[PDB]
Amino acid sequence: NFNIDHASVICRQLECGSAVSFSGSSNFGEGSGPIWFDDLICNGNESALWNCKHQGWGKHNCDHAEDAGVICSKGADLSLRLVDGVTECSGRLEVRFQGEWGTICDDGWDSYDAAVACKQLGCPTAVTAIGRVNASKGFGHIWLD
Amino acid sequence: NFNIDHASVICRQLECGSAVSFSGSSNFGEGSGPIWFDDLICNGNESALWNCKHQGWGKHNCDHAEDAGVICSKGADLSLRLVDGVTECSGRLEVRFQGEWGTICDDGWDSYDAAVACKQLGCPTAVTAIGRVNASKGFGHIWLDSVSCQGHEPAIWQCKHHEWGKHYCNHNEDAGVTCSDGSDLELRLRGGGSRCAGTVEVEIQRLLGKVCDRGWGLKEADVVCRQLGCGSALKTSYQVYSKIQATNTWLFLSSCNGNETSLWDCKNWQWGGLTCDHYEEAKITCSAH
Ligand SMILES: *[C@@H]1O[C@H](CO)[C@@H](O)[C@H](O)[C@H]1NC(C)=O
Ligand SMILES: *[C@@H]1O[C@H](CO)[C@@H](O)[C@H](O)[C@H]1NC(C)=O
Ligand SMILES: *[C@@H]1O[C@H](CO)[C@@H](O)[C@H](O)[C@H]1NC(C)=O
Ligand SMILES: [Ca+2]
Ligand SMILES: [Ca+2]
């Protein structure tokens, strides 16, 4: 009974940012060690899961021997780059997520988003425009939209 | 460079039989610790790697989640099965690990992996197609992902793949195969006024479907018209004369050079396992109409 809200509470407790992904079932090993907190209902904003409301401490009968896990924003090796442009400040944006490079959807892309990207890459921010210049469409996944 | 032959020696060195499977991409833990042996050339017939050809002496860098792991024959519960297909030789693929039944992710799945799986199960290997037809999304674990097979491996687990049990995949993208003698595959055009105009209809193993027009052009339409013997294609539409029944299954094409004799010869065509809703069916009008 793991959920995306639970990871957000865990990430915020550890000051690790936002939960970009969570790992379910026996992802990081067969169910082992003392099991303490399962089947608690959180609202997605509380600082810590124990401080978050629950049906009661120890009120859980878990089975199947699964160990939870979570990958947060600082845990993720999130990186940005520009590919297939005239210069190093032009081209198609690519973001590395889960260890694989992927592109970004064109939906909602405007000058404010391009302003953040140019500054983040270290490129000059005097004039920032959207559009991938002469670059071609990528073949990898599309992580962001 | 972790070939299968010297993985058998590792299993033999521990008196655990032969290496039934190779743990791809650091299955049994993350690579905490340094390395001592790497890139040694062993024929695999040796009793131990100690008395084997060391060849060169050098050190390089490897990913901490990209270290070695082996599964010996004694600790083997692996098996392959097909579930919820039209026939026995089609449907969703499942792999048994740790006494549990789990699916396979569709990333990295192509006709080369299908050929290994169809051969392993004993199904006909004349035409091997990816995609789960007629099946639903799986339930439970997702054991394998990004399987990379050259096409001659004896079993799927011998191939390159990721760590068992950890993947970013979702149960919607579940892998299946369709293995055929190449007897049951049929193509037709319906609703256009003759046999050389209409909507492309496929019937593979007595199940009716259509072809999505996501990557449909005149180069792909030429192969169908050539296959049917209706000359070259002219346009990707037609004038309707009747109504054609609706089906749920779909056929997906990657790309065709245009000189193929049949549609089944085009590389990496998927039968089922995916739904296209922002696109329509594929329609042709050949020149012999
Ligand atoms: C875009 O133009 C640059 C600069 O001449 C060139 O290096 C690059 O290869 C071009 N990209 C494509 C996809 O043609
Ligand atoms: C696939 O078709 C077979 C044979 O008609 C049927 O038994 C099965 O339930 C179908 N699977 C579905 C609809 O998921
Ligand atoms: C079709 O053209 C491709 C690309 O040139 C070539 O490799 C292939 O052999 C051709 N096939 C036939 C059947 O002529
Ligand atoms: Ca996919
Ligand atoms: Ca592959």
From Swiss-Prot, chain A:
Protein location: Cell membrane
Site (Cleavage): residue numbering on this chain: V83, D84, V95, R96
SRCR domain ranges (all copies): 1-73, 80-145
Cystine bridges: C11-C72, C42-C52
Subunit structure: Interacts with CSNK2B.
More about this protein: Intravenous lipopolysaccharide (LPS) produces a rapid rise of sCD163 in plasma of patient as it induces metalloproteinase-mediated shedding from monocytes surface. Long-term LPS infusion finally increases expression of the membrane-bound form on circulating monocytes. The soluble form (sCD163) in plasma is a novel parameter in diseases affecting macrophage function and monocyte/macrophage load in the body. The concentration of sCD163 is probably reflecting the number of macrophages of the 'alternative macrophage activation' phenotype with a high CD163 expression playing a major role in dampening the inflammatory response and scavenging components of damaged cells. This has initiated a number of clinical studies for evaluation of sCD163 as a disease marker in inflammatory conditions e.g.
Protein's recorded name: Scavenger receptor cysteine-rich type 1 protein M130
Lineage: Eukaryota, Metazoa, Chordata, Craniata, Vertebrata
Gene name, Swiss-Prot/TrEMBL: CD163
Shown chain mapped onto the complete sequence: 187 to 331 of 1156
